[PDB]
Every structure is written in C-alpha cells, then in structure tokens.
Amino acid sequence: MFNNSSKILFITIMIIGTLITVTSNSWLGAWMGLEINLLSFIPLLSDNNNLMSTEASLKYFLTQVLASTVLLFSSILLMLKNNMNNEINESFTSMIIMSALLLKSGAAPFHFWFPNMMEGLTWMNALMLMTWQKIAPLMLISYLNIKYLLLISVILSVIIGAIGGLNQTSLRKLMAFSSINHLGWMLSSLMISESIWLIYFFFYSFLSFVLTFMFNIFKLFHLNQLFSWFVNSKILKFTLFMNFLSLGGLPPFLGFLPKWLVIQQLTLCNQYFMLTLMMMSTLITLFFYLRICYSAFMMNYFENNWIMKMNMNSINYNMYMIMTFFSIFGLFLISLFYFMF
Amino acid sequence: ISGKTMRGGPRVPKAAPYPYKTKKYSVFNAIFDKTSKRFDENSKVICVEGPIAAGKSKFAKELAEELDMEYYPAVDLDLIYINSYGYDMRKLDPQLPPSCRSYDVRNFCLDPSHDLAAQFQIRMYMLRYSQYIDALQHVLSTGQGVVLERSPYSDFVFMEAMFRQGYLSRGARSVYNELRQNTIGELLKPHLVIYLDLPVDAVKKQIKARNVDYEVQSKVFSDAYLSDLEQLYKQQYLKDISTHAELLIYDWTAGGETEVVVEDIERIDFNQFEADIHNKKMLDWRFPLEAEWCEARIKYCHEKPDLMNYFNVPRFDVPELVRSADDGKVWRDVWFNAPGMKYRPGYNADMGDEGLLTKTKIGINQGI
Amino acid sequence: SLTPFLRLPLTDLTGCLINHQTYDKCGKFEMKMMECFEAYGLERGKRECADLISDFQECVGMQKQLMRFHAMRNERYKQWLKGERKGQEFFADPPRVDAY
Amino acid sequence: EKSLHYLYEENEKAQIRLLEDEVRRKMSERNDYQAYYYRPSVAKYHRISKEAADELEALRGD
Amino acid sequence: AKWYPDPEFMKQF
Amino acid sequence: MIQLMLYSLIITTSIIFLNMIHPLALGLTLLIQTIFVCLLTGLMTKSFWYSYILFLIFLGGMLVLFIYVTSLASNEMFNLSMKLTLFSSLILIFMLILSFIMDKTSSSLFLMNNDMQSIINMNSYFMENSLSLNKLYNFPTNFITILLMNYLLITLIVIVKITKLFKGPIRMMS
Amino acid sequence: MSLLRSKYYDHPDGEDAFGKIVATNKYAVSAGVAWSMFDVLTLSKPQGYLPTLGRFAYNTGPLMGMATAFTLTTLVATNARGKDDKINYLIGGFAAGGVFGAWKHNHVAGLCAGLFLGIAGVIKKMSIEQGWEFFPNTPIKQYGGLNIAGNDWTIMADPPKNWTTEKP
Amino acid sequence: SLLKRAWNEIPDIVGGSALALAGIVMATIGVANYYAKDGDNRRYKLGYVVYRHDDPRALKVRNDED
Amino acid sequence: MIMILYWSLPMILFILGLFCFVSNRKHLLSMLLSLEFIVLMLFFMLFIYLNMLNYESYFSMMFLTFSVCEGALGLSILVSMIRTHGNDYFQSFSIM
Ligand SMILES: Nc1nc2c(ncn2[C@H]2C[C@H](O)[C@@H](COP(=O)(O)OP(=O)(O)OP(=O)(O)O)O2)c(=O)[nH]1
Ligand SMILES: CCCCCCCCCCCC
C-alpha cells in the first residue's frame, strides 16, 4: 500500500483470506479464512513510530481472537447437534454464531472496540477496516435465519451509531460511529435481500472510499483542520463537501439511491416499524454530518494566514475527483443499472 | 567526505542518477530502482551556519565547488512573491487589505513591530521546509550530497530572538512551537554542520561591509539582538544538533579560506558511528536494509504533499495570524486573479504558454 | 450442507474438507441427503427431505441409539433401587470378546 | 388521446407489477424456481471426495 | 454577508 | 475409571487456572492441563498420534512464553490461599467418590477406539495412522495444505515485519 | 409448562389478570436486567457486592412498577366500561408515566413519559385490533439475484449425478 | 563467481543443494518409472479383495511371479 | 441429557477459559496463556467432533497451525508493545 511492497503482499493475502471466508460451504473453512484475514491485517495497522497504532492493533487482535474462538466453539456445537453444516430449525447455537459474527462486524452492543480503536489509525487503514473487514462477517450472517437477534442488533446499531457520533469532534471516531450507523442499514437489508445488501455495501464503500481520499490526501484528523484547510477557490470546497450530504442520504445525490433501495425492499417485505426507527436515526447522522458541512457552506471563514498553497498527490487526487463527480451527479445513472430488477 | 583533490578529479557517480523532478518515485517504482546503489562518502548533508552577516553564501558556494556537492542557498520570500512567470506580487498591495499586504525581509527591517512579521517568521520556516525535502530529494535519489545555507532546525532561534526583543507575543511563540512540534520530527537531521563563529560587534561591522540601505537604517540590528542570536545558537541549537551531527566551529573575524575548511572534513572518520546501531550520531541516516532506504526515499519523494499538509493546524486564539473573512475574499479575488497565478503555472495562457489544447502533464511536488 | 456465497475457484479446495464419504458407514446416507440437496435445494431440502436428514442425523450423531441405551441402563438401576432386581443377578450374561 | 395512451400504458404496467408481486410472493413462499429465491446447494464436492476415495482403494497395497 | 464564522464559532469544536 | 479421573483432574485444574494471578502459576497449571488433555484426547482415537502432536505444539509454545515471563513480569508476588486449596481438595475427593460410585459404562465416551471397531472392518487392520492422515496429502485437500505452507510463510513475514530486530532487545522500560 | 410461560394476548383483554401481570413483568425483568448488565460494568461502577445488587434493583424495580401499573390500569379501564378501545391503553400509559415521575421526582418527566407511553399504547392497540404485526416473518427473502444457478464459477469438473428428473 | 563465494563460505549449503538436486532428479525418475508401468495396480493388495469374473477390475489383475 | 452426559464438560471449561481471558489481569501474557487454554478446549471439542467421524481427524492439525499463528501474532504484538511503551500493563495502554 504505502512505502513497502510487503504491504501489497499483505493486501493480496487479505483479499485471498476474505474470499476464502465468503466462499466456504463449511463453517471451518470460513473460520480459517478469518484466521488468514486476521493474519493479514495485524501488520498493516502496526507502526513503531506511532504509540497509539500498536494499541489499536492490540485492541483489534484481542477483539478478533475472542470473536473467532466463540465462532469456532458454536460451529463445533452446531456440528455436534445438527450434524450438517447448517441447522434445520433455529436454536441457541445459531445465536452464538451470530453474536460471534456481530463482534467481528462491529455492530451494537458489541460495537465498543470499534471507535475506541479507530483513534489510533491512519485513514487508509480505517477505510480497509470499515469496508473490507465487514465483507467476511456480514456475508456469514446471511446463512442464519434469525429475526429477533438481528432486529435487536439493527435497532441498537442505528440508535447508538447516531447518538454516539455527536460527542466526538475527531473525524476518525465520528466516521467510525457513522460506519456503525450504516452497519445497521446493512444488517436490516441482510434478512430481506442479499443483493440489496450487496448494493448498499457497494455504495457505502464507494462513499467511504471517496471520503477517505479527501482526508488521506490533506491529512484532516480533526474537525477544525477542515476549517483551516486551504483551497484556492471556495467554490471548490463547497463542491467537495457535498459528499457528506450524499452519505446522509439526501437526494438528488448518489447516496440516496442505496438507502432508497433498502427502504423500497423493506416496505415490499412488510417491515414498517424498524424502518421508521431508522428514519429517526439517519437524521442524527445527517446532523453530525452537517458539522463538517459548516466548514464549506458559509463561503467565507476567519482562516489562518501563514499557509498559502495547497498540495496533493497526482494519481490520488486524480482518482478522487472521478468519484466526487459520481457522488453528486450519480442519479443520472439510474437508467444504466440493471441489478435491481 | 573526500574532496576534489584527493579524489584525483571530478566526482564520478556510483550509478545513474534518478530523474526525481521528472519521474515520480513510488512503491511500484521501488522494485526496479534501489536507493542505496548510489550512496557513497560524498552523499552527506552539510549545513553551513552562522550569524546575520558572516559570508555564508560565498563560503557555501566554494564548499559546494570543492566537495562536488549541490549548492542550496537560503530561501527568501522572492520564491512566492515572484512566481514562475517573474511577476512580483509586491505590486498588488494597493488593492489588498492592510492585514493582507506584502511583508518581506525589508518590511521587517523597516517595521519590526508589525503583526504579520510573526507570520513572516512562520512563513520562513515553511520555506526552509520547502527546501529541506528538496535537499533530501537530492541526496537519496541522485546520490550527491547537498550544502544548505540555513536549516529548518536553525529557525526557532530567530523566533526566540524576536520574542525576547518584544516583536512577538506569547501566542505566536506557542503557535510556532506547535508547528515545529508538528513538523520537525519527519525530517532527517543533517550529517555535518559548520558554524562560523563571530562576535556581536563584528557582525555589525560586516553590516557596514554590505552597505544595503534597509539593514543600515533599521533598528533590529542592535547589540542585544545579535547577542540573543549568539546565545540562542551556542546554548540551545548547536548543543542539540551535536548529538547527531559532527559540529565544526570556526572563527571568521578574518576573511578565511575554504580550503582548510575542506581539509578538516577528511580528517573526520564517519565510519566510527556505524559500530553501534543505537549510536545517537548518524542515527536518522542509518538504514539496515535496502527496503528501508527505499522506504525513506518514498517518504521524501512521494509524500512531500504529506509533509506540506502537516502544516494545516488550527490556531484561532491569536489575532496576528487570523485573516479576516472579508479580507480573505478580497485577497483571493485580487491575488488569484492576478497575471501569472490565474491557473496552475503550467497551464497559463495569459503569459504566453502554447499548446494547451493537447497538454495533460502536471509537475511532481508542485505548488498549485 | 451450507452454500457458497459469491462462489469462486477458491471454494474448490475448501468444499472437500469435512465430509462422510471417506470410508465411513454413514456417508451413503449423507450422499442420499446431498442428492436431494442438489435436487430440491438447500431451502426446499429442509422441508422435503425430513426423512433423509433424520436418518443421517441419528446415523452419525447416534442420538436415538444413545437415548435408547441410557434408558436401558437407567431402568436396570431403577429396578435395583426399587428392589425388583436382585444384586446377584443385577447384570446379565456377558458377550464373547470375539463377538462384535 | 395522449392521455388515453399514457393511461393504458400505466394501467398495464400497474397490472404487471401487481402480477409480478404475487408471482414473487408465491415463489418465495415455496422456493420453487431456480432464479430468484433459490439458495443453491451442490453435491459436487461429496461426489469428488467419494470418487477420490474410490480411486484410493485401488492404490492400497504393496 | 455581514456575519462570517469568527474564532468564537471556531472555539466550540 | 481413568477417564472419569481425568475428568476430575481437568475440572480441578480448570478451577485452579481460573484463580491464578501469576503467569507462572498459569504456565504450570496449563502444563498439567495439557498433559491431562493429551491423555483424554488419546482415549477417543484409534491411534495416539494427535496427542503426541498436540504435546509437541504446546511444549514448543510455552517454551517461548517463559522467556517473555522472565523479560516482562519477572518480578511478581505469589500468594497461596488456604481457601483455594481446601476447595480444590474437597471438590477433588468429592469427584473421585462420585466417579467411584458411578456406572462407568454410561459415563464412557461413545467415540470408537481401535478395539471398539468391529472385526469386519478391513480398514481397521491397516497401519494405525495411515487412513486418518491420508487426506492431508491426497488430491481433494492437498491445496489446503498448499494454503497452509503459504500461510506459514506469510505468518513468518508478518512476524519479521512487526518485530523489528534492528530496534534492539526487548525488556521492561526499554 | 407453568404460569411463568404465559403471554399477554393468550386471553382477551380484561378476562385474565395474573398472566398479564407475569408476562408484562417478564418483559420488564428482561429489559431491566439487560440495561443493568450493560450499566453496572460500564458506567458508574459500584465496586461492591451489595451496591451492584442495589443498582440491579434500581434499574429493575421501577420497570416492574411501570408494568404492573400499566397492566392494572388497563385491566380496571377494561372492566369498568363494556367496550374495549385505545384510550384505556392511553390512560395506562399515563399511569406508567406517573410511575416514571415517582421514580425521578420530576412531574414533567411523568407527564411527557405518560404522553409517549400512551401514544405507544394506542399504536399497539391499533396493531392488535387491526391485525397487522410490528415485526412479521419476512414473506419475500431474496437469497440472490437472477441467474443464481448460472454463476457457478468453479474450476473442478462435476462428476455425474445420482439423481434424475425422469420418472421410472 | 557467486558459486566460489558460496563454496568458500558456506560449503555445507552447496553440498546440501547438490544432494537436494540429486533427490529431485531421483524423485522425477521414480515417478516416471512408477507411472511408466501400471504402478497404480499393485501386485500385492492390502486387505482381502475378491473380484467376480464379469467385473471390470478382474482383467486388470496381474499374474506375475514372486 | 445426551448433550449433558457427553461434551457438556468442555463447554463449561471453555466458558471458564473465556472468563479467564477477560478477567482484570495486570499483564497481557496472562491473556496469552488464557488464549492457549481456550485453544486446548477448542481442540477437545473439535476432537470430539472429528472422532465421531472415522477418518477426518487430519483437520485437527490445521486448527493447531492457525492457533499457533494466532499465538505468534499475540507474541509479536507483545514485542511491539515494547517498541512504543516500556511495559505490558493493560492500565498503561490508552483507553481511547
Ligand atoms: N526576521 C527574520 N529575518 C531573517 C531570518 N533569517 C534571516 N533573516 C534576515 C536577517 C538579515 O536581514 C538577513 C541576513 O541573512 P543571513 O543571516 O541568512 O545571511 P546573508 O543573507 O547576509 O548571507 P551571508 O551570510 O552574508 O552570505 O536575513 C529569520 O528567520 N527572520
Ligand atoms: C519439482 C517437482 C518434482 C516432482 C516431479 C514429478 C513429475 C515428473 C514428471 C512426470 C511425467 C509423467
């Protein structure tokens, strides 16, 4: 990834381990794929010149090792009682499998490691943590037909990930609490349609992957670093900050589309109350999105005087502005898509 | 570090020099090209030092000529007030607000007690930072060492000299200390430093050896201020650097000669610090693997916008470093609508650039 | 068995990890269950293969056989505690060691 | 007559949407068709391992 | 246009 | 009788392991725990291979962990308690009495040993660890073994990357 | 198989009392024990064997007061008038809000909580008389898109199957 | 050039590499000799195997001399 | 009853190992030893499952390999604590 080819090797074994996990027709192959993914993701997220990155790596290690051992325990119990790879009728060992998967995914009430560890990271490893490391536990939740435990996780995730993100002014913990709130929308789609979950995950990872690039290039680790961020035209900062209204679900931006397809598929499947509970949740998420959006919508700011030129990478800022165009004017591609039929 | 005479001629490179100003060096470029294939005994950073008037430019140019190194003079504020097209932006000050007007070295000398002078000091540190990576791009990628007329490490003494004379408040000192704590830890300390020691009065005599008007009609060049620089240098800065760099102190009351200064360099054994891997001398410049050398070269070539974006820190409690929002918009609509900076400096049709219809190239590590 | 979600060539090694086909007495029953799990599917196989699932389950898990054995052992000790079974004739005749 | 044509088109689209809603509900209720709600399970790996164990019986010996 | 974000607005973050 | 004794010893050592603050008490408790677990695992399989393998694994692991005991938390106080000794002794004598008064046919494991298998099983007459360990090197699951070789190489690369040898030795207050 | 294994709507409303008390207090026990289990370890740690049980009682017992007061108020309002309706659930919600106000020594919380729980009660009564379910079993459960059979990308060859669709 | 340095400083590694290359050549020769003849159909078979005359495995049975 | 007479014990010992893993201990290496204990009890339960089946005990070495690489990851994390801190106290690490 950065500064070493061995990090590219670690990304390769990361992709290999996650794709080994999600393709497994047995829980043991999924478990060993999670072991490969954990092995790959410990060395990225470790840096000896940072005192808090090693603590974040330790928190990730302890949380994933506890969650992987409970997952193997209840998998072995499921094989002990109902000798095939699945269960005919739902029982408590399926709930233990789902709880051990929810500790890996970071959903509430097992969410507490996730923003407490994200303070120790950079932005690229944060993006790998809250997008790709949610492929393997969320795709394994799809094999379990449990409604009450998943519904409790959905309600707790959308309540906590909205409320909890109000207090932090640091962008990493705020974006982690935003990822907890968007995890509840993914888990709410997981028991109605796996394709609609894949679409919400792809567009959420797209909006995460374009909002990381604005913070990775300019090194914006705090809320007032946005207010002190220098741009050569204030209309450019006004346009670049529209991706938070996209991630808040405001039409006519691109991020209204995955929330909208989740709402359409939930109402077709006759769920209305938890959908209404997720309406009140995303207003608070849009509220703490707007405190970032204070830094560009007032058009003139009392700014620091010493900095005069802004600097960026070539290929990273070139790839950033392709997706910022599609995160604003992405609803003109509504006719091109054919997944949703 | 062998000179021109002991080598028997001009310096020959150990390998082909990397075009670091034209080709971007990244992680995928680190496989085919390796950093430590070009390093030799001449690939060291030498920083010449001293007071206000000590003949640093001519001595540093002669040291660059004798040791076959690249000469890097001290950065002034004509690098940003005069852009790449030669247009000086000091003529824009009628249209600009008085809190956004041009402030250079002679504006500090005529008006020491101005607020933006504190900004000027901070600005100078950024400019020194803007050459030091340009020093470290030259040592790592080509294998030829550099000489620096002044260092980014050598600029907090100027801040404390303005602070003890009363030109800066506590808030600007705290701001510049916060930017120094934020930014100086990413740099590599230089290999060798040469300090040209001078008394407090003789530098003033050397002011009369320069005969420029804004330094003789000014007020800052007094007995207490130059003594403050001498005390700050010899009691904090050189003692902090001598734990890493081989310090060489000369008396320069006379004219001096650069050849004996060259001949003292080869008497230093630079391989005696490599016996201990935890030695404080040359600690930042030792690398156990070729991949760590390429890691440092990637950090200093592909992550120069990273180190320039580390300066983005918020400090709003001071009233000297905060630009007004109406004054900021007026400054933007004057400064960025001026000739020479309407667009990126490659693509400016108002200054005679041709072939813009088929041009899609941008400069690597270029200020937009 | 489970299903591969977004199946790739990487599931071909994983798919043959644990199964009863390698020299086991139950695997033919398992094979028959897998036959309708290829025919009806994983979801219709939970309803239309209730006979084939249960035979494999009490063939390899041995649930009903061990509940039968523990009912046979508990009734003998219950008769010994109640006094119907004499302590000298508490256990029956042992099998030959060459048997089974 | 443009309103008549658009009303005919929208009424037929509403009827087909209702019909596909009942078709999808009856398909997801009983899991009958292979297309939408079918969760595919294969007995390919069991047959592969049984075939490999069948070839390994011939190779036992000395 | 008459009011813009002052450092007192900047202080709460 | 021996299996129920191993049950009682594993229960008593697990009570001891849950109550020990000092890392060396945990190390000795898990030494006797892995001894008893190795014997119990052997009872279930026809051959005694994986008990030996698990013993080489768990003696190759805690050999390193003692060096980290002597490098980190070398100085920590042992605290013997009479309550834990009395509790472990009373529970141990109670479970030996309960195992002595128990029917050992009902408490025996249903997993088949090498002699519990019937005479008609021609696969039982082969060499005792051949058909159990065969599928590591057979055609369907050699690729998992390939994946394990590459996984161990990637593990070693990770260990070399996040234990920088050139930063110096490790101790308390380094 | 006891009186603890009872539901709220196993009988028509007003017919049964003790089963409704046991059921509504069972949900109160579950909510209070769950919130106190995520309370006494996480924020305001009691650091004692007895104040932990005191915080358990503090987070549990007022929820029993809520459940018992709402169920008794709904039972009295159902047994008073002949017709069953929504404002019985509304005044039961106001009684539970008064229990909240007695807990927190704040009348304003007691009213606002009474209004909120009355709105919850009339919505639940609309659910039980109109027939719709709050969290129904999902009728449409997409396990994939179109061509879920057609995107098998595996490199191993399939052996011939042992099952046919042909009748014997 | 590099073979003389490896044969001067680490000669046991060079001897082991020669032994391992000889082992790889002998493994190739052994596999080719095993699969040149009918190596999968071994002469002496573990267990007690009986084949009927109409079985396809019956005509593959060897009739060599001990 | 059948779940009680057979394999109910290593669930209890795995729960005790999980409670030993999450207990308030001063050092990280005690948590590493509790990880080794829950590896032992997961080996017990996986070994019961793989010995109901006849010849599928070859998987029991793969779980050992992934568990040893987990322990090696934990040991290298314990080394990387010394690169930043001077200690392995869990109170000394950052709570946020
Ligand atoms: N305010 C301020 N003035 C500075 C700073 N650095 C240099 N100057 C000014 C002081 C004098 O006017 C002038 C002297 O420049 P130097 O001391 O770098 O040497 P000079 O340019 O005379 O070159 P020389 O040594 O004669 O070759 O630059 C700084 O950080 N702050
Ligand atoms: C490095 C590989 C050694 C083993 C090679 C086995 C195959 C040899 C050739 C067989 C031809 C049929």
PDB file of N, CA and C and ligand atoms in Angstrom, chain B residues 50-58 74 105 108-109 120-121 124 128 149-150 155 158 162 210 214-215 221 225, ligand 1:
ATOM      1  N   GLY B  50      25.623  30.240  10.962  1.00  0.00           N
ATOM      2  CA  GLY B  50      26.231  31.454  11.447  1.00  0.00           C
ATOM      3  C   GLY B  50      25.268  32.592  11.717  1.00  0.00           C
ATOM      4  N   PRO B  51      25.825  33.765  12.045  1.00  0.00           N
ATOM      5  CA  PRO B  51      25.004  34.956  12.301  1.00  0.00           C
ATOM      6  C   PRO B  51      24.476  35.623  11.039  1.00  0.00           C
ATOM      7  N   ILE B  52      23.946  36.841  11.219  1.00  0.00           N
ATOM      8  CA  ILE B  52      23.293  37.596  10.146  1.00  0.00           C
ATOM      9  C   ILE B  52      24.252  37.869   8.990  1.00  0.00           C
ATOM     10  N   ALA B  53      25.453  38.351   9.291  1.00  0.00           N
ATOM     11  CA  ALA B  53      26.430  38.682   8.256  1.00  0.00           C
ATOM     12  C   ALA B  53      27.730  37.944   8.557  1.00  0.00           C
ATOM     13  N   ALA B  54      27.960  36.833   7.853  1.00  0.00           N
ATOM     14  CA  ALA B  54      29.152  36.028   8.082  1.00  0.00           C
ATOM     15  C   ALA B  54      29.780  35.505   6.797  1.00  0.00           C
ATOM     16  N   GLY B  55      29.321  35.951   5.632  1.00  0.00           N
ATOM     17  CA  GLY B  55      29.810  35.416   4.372  1.00  0.00           C
ATOM     18  C   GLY B  55      29.432  33.970   4.128  1.00  0.00           C
ATOM     19  N   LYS B  56      28.176  33.605   4.401  1.00  0.00           N
ATOM     20  CA  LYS B  56      27.760  32.213   4.268  1.00  0.00           C
ATOM     21  C   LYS B  56      27.570  31.802   2.813  1.00  0.00           C
ATOM     22  N   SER B  57      27.152  32.733   1.949  1.00  0.00           N
ATOM     23  CA  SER B  57      26.811  32.385   0.570  1.00  0.00           C
ATOM     24  C   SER B  57      28.050  32.043  -0.250  1.00  0.00           C
ATOM     25  N   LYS B  58      29.086  32.885  -0.169  1.00  0.00           N
ATOM     26  CA  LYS B  58      30.309  32.653  -0.932  1.00  0.00           C
ATOM     27  C   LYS B  58      31.067  31.437  -0.413  1.00  0.00           C
ATOM     28  N   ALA B  74      20.031  30.127   1.052  1.00  0.00           N
ATOM     29  CA  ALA B  74      18.947  30.357   1.995  1.00  0.00           C
ATOM     30  C   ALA B  74      17.732  30.907   1.272  1.00  0.00           C
ATOM     31  N   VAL B 105      11.512  40.754   3.960  1.00  0.00           N
ATOM     32  CA  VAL B 105      12.628  40.982   4.882  1.00  0.00           C
ATOM     33  C   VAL B 105      12.833  42.476   5.134  1.00  0.00           C
ATOM     34  N   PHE B 108      10.245  43.779   7.345  1.00  0.00           N
ATOM     35  CA  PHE B 108      10.562  43.503   8.742  1.00  0.00           C
ATOM     36  C   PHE B 108      11.583  44.500   9.270  1.00  0.00           C
ATOM     37  N   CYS B 109      12.569  44.855   8.443  1.00  0.00           N
ATOM     38  CA  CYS B 109      13.634  45.749   8.886  1.00  0.00           C
ATOM     39  C   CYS B 109      13.128  47.174   9.083  1.00  0.00           C
ATOM     40  N   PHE B 120       5.520  36.183   9.035  1.00  0.00           N
ATOM     41  CA  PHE B 120       6.715  36.142   8.199  1.00  0.00           C
ATOM     42  C   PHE B 120       7.706  35.118   8.720  1.00  0.00           C
ATOM     43  N   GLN B 121       7.885  35.075  10.052  1.00  0.00           N
ATOM     44  CA  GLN B 121       8.800  34.111  10.653  1.00  0.00           C
ATOM     45  C   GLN B 121       8.312  32.692  10.419  1.00  0.00           C
ATOM     46  N   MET B 124       8.832  31.795   6.848  1.00  0.00           N
ATOM     47  CA  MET B 124      10.223  31.496   6.535  1.00  0.00           C
ATOM     48  C   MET B 124      10.548  30.055   6.878  1.00  0.00           C
ATOM     49  N   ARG B 128      11.950  27.131   4.478  1.00  0.00           N
ATOM     50  CA  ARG B 128      13.107  26.293   4.765  1.00  0.00           C
ATOM     51  C   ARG B 128      12.725  24.826   4.697  1.00  0.00           C
ATOM     52  N   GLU B 149      22.504  26.656   3.078  1.00  0.00           N
ATOM     53  CA  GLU B 149      22.983  27.886   3.703  1.00  0.00           C
ATOM     54  C   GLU B 149      22.344  28.094   5.072  1.00  0.00           C
ATOM     55  N   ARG B 150      21.112  27.620   5.261  1.00  0.00           N
ATOM     56  CA  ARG B 150      20.460  27.604   6.565  1.00  0.00           C
ATOM     57  C   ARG B 150      19.504  26.420   6.617  1.00  0.00           C
ATOM     58  N   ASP B 155      15.808  27.766  12.718  1.00  0.00           N
ATOM     59  CA  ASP B 155      14.893  28.885  12.567  1.00  0.00           C
ATOM     60  C   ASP B 155      14.075  29.198  13.811  1.00  0.00           C
ATOM     61  N   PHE B 158      15.580  32.330  15.592  1.00  0.00           N
ATOM     62  CA  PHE B 158      15.090  33.618  15.113  1.00  0.00           C
ATOM     63  C   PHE B 158      13.758  33.975  15.759  1.00  0.00           C
ATOM     64  N   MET B 162      13.118  37.270  18.103  1.00  0.00           N
ATOM     65  CA  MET B 162      12.030  38.245  18.028  1.00  0.00           C
ATOM     66  C   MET B 162      11.207  38.273  19.308  1.00  0.00           C
ATOM     67  N   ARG B 210      28.312  45.404   3.937  1.00  0.00           N
ATOM     68  CA  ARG B 210      27.293  45.116   2.936  1.00  0.00           C
ATOM     69  C   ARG B 210      26.702  46.370   2.311  1.00  0.00           C
ATOM     70  N   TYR B 214      18.359  49.144   3.761  1.00  0.00           N
ATOM     71  CA  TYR B 214      17.337  48.713   4.708  1.00  0.00           C
ATOM     72  C   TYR B 214      17.911  47.975   5.908  1.00  0.00           C
ATOM     73  N   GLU B 215      19.173  47.554   5.857  1.00  0.00           N
ATOM     74  CA  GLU B 215      19.822  46.958   7.014  1.00  0.00           C
ATOM     75  C   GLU B 215      20.700  47.939   7.781  1.00  0.00           C
ATOM     76  N   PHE B 221      19.049  45.472  14.144  1.00  0.00           N
ATOM     77  CA  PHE B 221      20.448  45.055  14.230  1.00  0.00           C
ATOM     78  C   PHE B 221      21.146  45.897  15.295  1.00  0.00           C
ATOM     79  N   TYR B 225      20.143  42.180  20.259  1.00  0.00           N
ATOM     80  CA  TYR B 225      19.513  41.215  19.362  1.00  0.00           C
ATOM     81  C   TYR B 225      20.524  40.208  18.822  1.00  0.00           C
TER      82      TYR B 225
HETATM   83  N1  LIG J   1      13.110  38.237  10.628  1.00  0.00           N
HETATM   84  C1  LIG J   1      13.970  37.338  10.136  1.00  0.00           C
HETATM   85  N2  LIG J   1      14.999  37.753   9.403  1.00  0.00           N
HETATM   86  C2  LIG J   1      15.769  36.725   8.983  1.00  0.00           C
HETATM   87  C3  LIG J   1      15.605  35.380   9.223  1.00  0.00           C
HETATM   88  N3  LIG J   1      16.615  34.650   8.610  1.00  0.00           N
HETATM   89  C4  LIG J   1      17.357  35.557   8.020  1.00  0.00           C
HETATM   90  N4  LIG J   1      16.899  36.836   8.210  1.00  0.00           N
HETATM   91  C5  LIG J   1      17.432  38.105   7.719  1.00  0.00           C
HETATM   92  C6  LIG J   1      18.246  38.884   8.733  1.00  0.00           C
HETATM   93  C7  LIG J   1      19.106  39.745   7.817  1.00  0.00           C
HETATM   94  O1  LIG J   1      18.384  40.868   7.326  1.00  0.00           O
HETATM   95  C8  LIG J   1      19.406  38.789   6.669  1.00  0.00           C
HETATM   96  C9  LIG J   1      20.704  38.035   6.804  1.00  0.00           C
HETATM   97  O2  LIG J   1      20.597  36.786   6.086  1.00  0.00           O
HETATM   98  P1  LIG J   1      21.500  35.564   6.580  1.00  0.00           P
HETATM   99  O3  LIG J   1      21.846  35.755   8.016  1.00  0.00           O
HETATM  100  O4  LIG J   1      20.871  34.277   6.164  1.00  0.00           O
HETATM  101  O5  LIG J   1      22.805  35.810   5.693  1.00  0.00           O
HETATM  102  P2  LIG J   1      23.010  36.761   4.429  1.00  0.00           P
HETATM  103  O6  LIG J   1      21.778  36.721   3.593  1.00  0.00           O
HETATM  104  O7  LIG J   1      23.537  38.069   4.908  1.00  0.00           O
HETATM  105  O8  LIG J   1      24.177  35.982   3.668  1.00  0.00           O
HETATM  106  P3  LIG J   1      25.738  35.922   4.015  1.00  0.00           P
HETATM  107  O9  LIG J   1      25.840  35.240   5.350  1.00  0.00           O
HETATM  108  O10 LIG J   1      26.191  37.355   4.057  1.00  0.00           O
HETATM  109  O11 LIG J   1      26.384  35.139   2.906  1.00  0.00           O
HETATM  110  O12 LIG J   1      18.316  37.843   6.635  1.00  0.00           O
HETATM  111  C10 LIG J   1      14.507  34.945  10.006  1.00  0.00           C
HETATM  112  O13 LIG J   1      14.200  33.787  10.320  1.00  0.00           O
HETATM  113  N5  LIG J   1      13.725  36.020  10.428  1.00  0.00           N
END
